Design a protein around this ligand. Structure first.
Ligand SMILES: [Cl-]
Ligand SMILES: [Cl-]
Ligand SMILES: [Cl-]
Ligand SMILES: [Cl-]
Ligand SMILES: [Cl-]
Ligand SMILES: [Cl-]
Lengths: 299, 297, 299, 298
């Protein structure tokens, strides 16, 4: 009963670099009839499942270069499109989108597919949300691949983050393909730009895109920080898995400085892979990340 | 003419393009269709740089070049074609064609009574604009030409055919995406905002859709009829100064196309070849405007 | 012939080019001048990819292409021209000329009795190499061609004249600098080390100095005499398959020069145009090797 | 001091750096070792921008910044360190060390009697230069800092250790190659020529070889002794204005290392973060010089 738009299917008819048939779930508890799209590739009896979480303003298409590396190695991959993104349904009311709304959708998806032996792969809000999940499902998660992201700790926001919020407030709507192409350079072509704009025929479809910047916590009393501080405890003290970090250096907000701070709270995190040519959207340079992660790991 | 006007709020964040736009809505034949244009520098300047955009851009594309020209004491006129920028946008596909666009520019030129014109063009800016001086010879003095072509009715290159099929298969062209993909580090997200600004949705993009369809496949197309006469004009009648800048990272209208063009422009000096620039040469255009001016008398 | 041999210690750090070099020091006419060449793949392979470098490179330039060819079951031969790479380096200016280089390659071909050759060339690799098949038509089956030209005697374009004057004004050409400037992110500092490795000082660079001087300024030059015959061969006699890849960021031998070249190669398909590649196309050469092979009927 | 002088013909093609060099060869302690330096702008300018290069560069690195400073009515002094640029080049390994370099700069400063100094530094330029104001407090007014660090004795990051082992294992460092790899499109072949110009062969590169060897691995090192006293100075005694520009494409002294540095510079505003710039920030330095000047009260 949540008012939402479904992106017309013709928007997805030209996706040559992402040739997976999407799967759908529309009975997640609390979200009844809101349909979540997700990629599911590799053998269901694979030992390990790579759960690949996107953020703002992307979808599972972002993971198109990483997915084949994981499936070539004999693993399963699950890459959902968050509500408001990709091929998932898109609520049209501002207030529906929040930290809890997104986090719980992922928790429900995980329990719906009964995912186990999970390698969490995350970036941006993918990590902001996703890194807060294993603490409440410890037996499901075994390893972590982390890219440009952060866990909210409630500290005053850096100028770059504040500027980002004010930008998204002032503009008519965010140019989604524009933003990604500006970040990724030669790693994104016009076919990719088409794919990134595909979910959003107009601004009525971009309420989730509008809401993510507004959701960045400005005080310690936000859900993002409440969950965040518990997660930091989990990765520092409870976590006993293997991790791998890849940093896109051309990121003024969640680049090297923010990632190294994050590394300090992930117990066992080895030396990060630092990709000088990569921006915030690390997965556009993600073949070598997926290869090196796998080589580093004991599968 | 049935058309949409882009809401003004779309243009409220343009820090790199701080000109107040001018408007004309009584061009002969286009009555009530409002054309937006930049007009900067002293009206009594010796020379006027007439800067013509193509697909899928607007006068914003010239924002780096304009200050170079005005700093040197000249006037600049940079119109937004109908279907683009802040101009009105016809909603019927048949309204857009080679004559529709060419005549709009001819009318604008006569309306402002532009004289001592330095034609600056690229893409359809040139496809159209390079066909104009032959029919108004005394108004044009010099030429700055960037990645463009004059239609000659020859077989289409494979890249151009692929471009047409792309635009016919997709839902709509990702405007900011395309420019950002082409121009790399020369374009930021504020620029992407500007390029997407004219087009709240695909109903505003009928002109953007039509440009690729207009690429001529028949020697009886107006583009080629005008085109062949233009080639004669630049080769035999033109007596002005010219300067060419080539964005090398262009698979359709790059070096090969530009060198062929140079052969038909009498007096055209050695081109400036910008290895880092793509099709949208004006995003690398400060040094083009500087070198053009230094080369010119 | 008086020459210098680059000290072996210069080549001790080449992790991206882990082939043991072969040597030949009794090529007819070049007695005791030792030519280095890579030779990889089964000797009885159907086809041999003969990969010719130009100014101021060596077989290292082909390091990304070689594994693609050998992983498809073919043999690869990549010589270092005299004055370059691991080959011996004549110290007298006059020894280097079009005939000197061309004949060394002809002698190497006969010495190894190479047959079923796929000619891979660029720069002087092509300027020289594209003139060889007309005098050994039975040996050559296919062609992979990148930013190069065949001399026709026409007045030189301004860029080429500027290149000759710049070479003749400077103390010496900065070898690694030039390649790194051209190839961008496709070359790292380990690659720069490899490109500087042949040349401890300018006494080793007489061949490097001579190549720009050899660009023909009169139609009686050997480059043009052989050149015009070659043009006839590719346009009327040649009956093989070809594939052309153009590095677009090349102000001298880019798109315009390569399209002119295409007109004289009978059967040459639509070129692969690489927007991110410069003159040194082989630094972007994985995809060139892959696509060449896919385009070819390798039987 | 046994040294080589780069033959003058090496510098005959420098169209992007058309300043006539000045020389001093009687710096106290340095025998007749001749140091080259650029000195532009009016000699009586209020402020002098002292622009310090590091490994493996010279004053040429500052060619894009110098005109911005001189256009604004200021003086610029940009020395070539001994072993670099047009300066003389000791041929013995042990002559190069932290003290050797630091004292050369102190002597140059006292020789020209430089006064209202804006310290501009990067790499060893900062490693050395940032340790000088604490012993000449009255002569320094402001700071422009780019990808650099002050030695604190803490464990080396893996990338730094790898950098040292690289320089040990190779025949010699490809100087133009390294700079071109870092700066990309901001450097052309004419620039590559300028960067290789000081070094006809490895005999001229002893200072280039020695800088990586000089990186301190633990707290027992002159770099760190000076370093820890400098950190105190910038944190507690410094009262001037500062401006930081970070080249983000730097795996060693990029955003993480620069933000750590910012914490010890009292009054250091938000850094300018240049996504396209590498370690050699000055190759992207026009906008750094412009924004520094706009940020400053002079
Ligand atoms: Cl719907
Ligand atoms: Cl949808
Ligand atoms: Cl966000
Ligand atoms: Cl078009
Ligand atoms: Cl040459
Ligand atoms: Cl160092």
């Amino acid at each position: 009963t949540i008012k939402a738009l479904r992106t017309p299917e013709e928007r997805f008819s030209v996706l040559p670099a992402f040739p997976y048939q999407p799967n759908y779930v529309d009975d997640l508890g609390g979200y009844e009839s809101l349909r979540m799209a997700y990629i599911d590739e590799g053998d269901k009896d694979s030992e390990y499942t790579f759960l690949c979480l996107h953020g703002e303003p992307t979808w599972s298409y972002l993971y198109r270069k990483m997915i084949p590396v994981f499936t070539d190695a004999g693993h399963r991959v699950v890459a959902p499109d968050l509500f408001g993104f990709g091929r998932s349904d898109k609520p049209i009311e501002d207030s529906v989108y929040n930290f809890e709304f997104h986090r719980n959708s992922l928790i429900q998806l995980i329990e719906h597919l009964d995912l186990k032996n999970i390698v969490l792969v995350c970036q941006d809000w993918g990590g902001g949300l996703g890194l807060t999940i294993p603490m409440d499902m410890q037996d499901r998660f075994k390893k972590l691949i982390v890219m440009n992201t952060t866990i909210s700790n409630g500290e005053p926001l850096a100028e770059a983050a504040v500027q980002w919020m004010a930008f998204n407030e002032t503009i008519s709507e965010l140019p989604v393909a524009g933003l990604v192409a500006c970040d990724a350079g030669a790693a994104v072509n016009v076919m990719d730009a088409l794919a990134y704009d595909a979910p959003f025929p107009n601004k009525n479809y971009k309420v989730g895109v509008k809401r993510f910047p507004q959701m960045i916590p400005t005080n310690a009393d936000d859900d993002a920080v409440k969950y965040g501080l518990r997660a930091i405890e989990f990765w520092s003290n409870e976590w006993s898995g293997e991790s791998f970090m890849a940093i896109g250096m051309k990121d003024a907000v969640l680049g090297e400085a923010a990632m190294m701070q994050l590394k300090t709270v992930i117990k066992g995190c080895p030396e990060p892979m630092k990709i000088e040519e990569a921006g915030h959207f690390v997965q556009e340079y993600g073949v070598e990340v997926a290869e090196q992660a796998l080589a580093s790991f004991t599968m």
